[PDB]
């Protein structure tokens, strides 16, 4: 194997696991949920605003280990409710809408912090 | 990274997402869902009906990028119950029982358009 | 592709599935349930034997292809309820503690067999 991934533009992972992994040319992002990376508190108001805090978490990981937006092959959007969808797709967009990588979209029953919104990701650079 | 997946055997990923994204010699396949590629509309029948579609878009989606059901590694099926595993298990089976790739079967609290079944892969060739 | 993994020390794949895939250096593995090898029945106690009976297959099924456990760089643990999150991280961080791989931990409706604990896993090794 090669390197994990720790910075404080992304919430730190407290527990037995790392914000990503980079391996080769390959990273595997850990399922990021709308919390702020300095005050460590949940994000509190629309599911936009949680979805920006989301992405902006995946965005910092993916830069801290080298990676790029444009380097995401494969996302997975786990969610409380599917009624998010249209306007997590909205901010979704202004991160991915010229990159495109694969994507599953799924509602769960609970996810940490009994947040309603988590996306992981696996990257892939160079060629 | 290298290319992007767009059929029109299998559903059209209309939102900010790819059917699937060929990097190197992998490719990462979006969950697929039981929509007619031609109709656009929901199968409505039995389980068996439903698993039947979301295998027929995969394997669409794999050969229009050069890759098949052999080369598949890892599934992810998604349902909204456990009582459909004997079921979806025998249509899979017609696809995949003798290559018999990784798999992970859970049942989430709902899924897209409020379907019953969505299944994602990842598929690897050459050697 | 390359090779599949089959061992007793692990629950047998039943269904057109495989316990894990290895596709050169990479490994991808079907996720575990409490269930014991030899006797093929559920573990009914505590979450942490639970866990711990998840972990044991998982390990099983890497050093069976010739894998570890600080080969492994993504996991995602499903589950029923997040009420289970501290003590499953106190059994999980006993075998990557000190590896760290990155994770997605969430909770969903159901689970086969009824479980209440699956983990699957993506190992890469080599450099």
């Known amino acids: 194997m090669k390197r994990f991934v720790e910075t404080d533009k ?8 790392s914000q990503a992994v980079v391996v ?4 595997f992002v850990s399922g990021q949920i709308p919390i702020d990376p300095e ?3 949940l994000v509190q108001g629309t599911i936009e605003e949680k979805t920006e805090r989301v992405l902006e978490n995946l965005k910092a990981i993916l830069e801290a280990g080298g990676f790029s937006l444009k380097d995401v ?3 997975t959007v786990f969610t409380t409710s599917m009624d998010y ?3 997590v797709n909205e901010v979704y967009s202004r991160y991915f809408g010229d990159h495109r990588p694969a994507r ?7 996810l940490p912090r ?13 060629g």
């Open 10 to 17: 992304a919430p730190k992972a407290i527990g037995p696991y």
């Open 39 to 41: 005050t460590g508190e």
């Open 114 to 126: 009994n947040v309603e919104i988590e996306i992981e990701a696996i990257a892939v650079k160079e």
């Open 104 to 110: 599953s979209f799924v509602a769960v029953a609970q």
């Open 73 to 75: 092959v494969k996302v």
């Open 24 to 27: 080769g040319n390959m990273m």
């Open 85 to 87: 969808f249209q306007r």
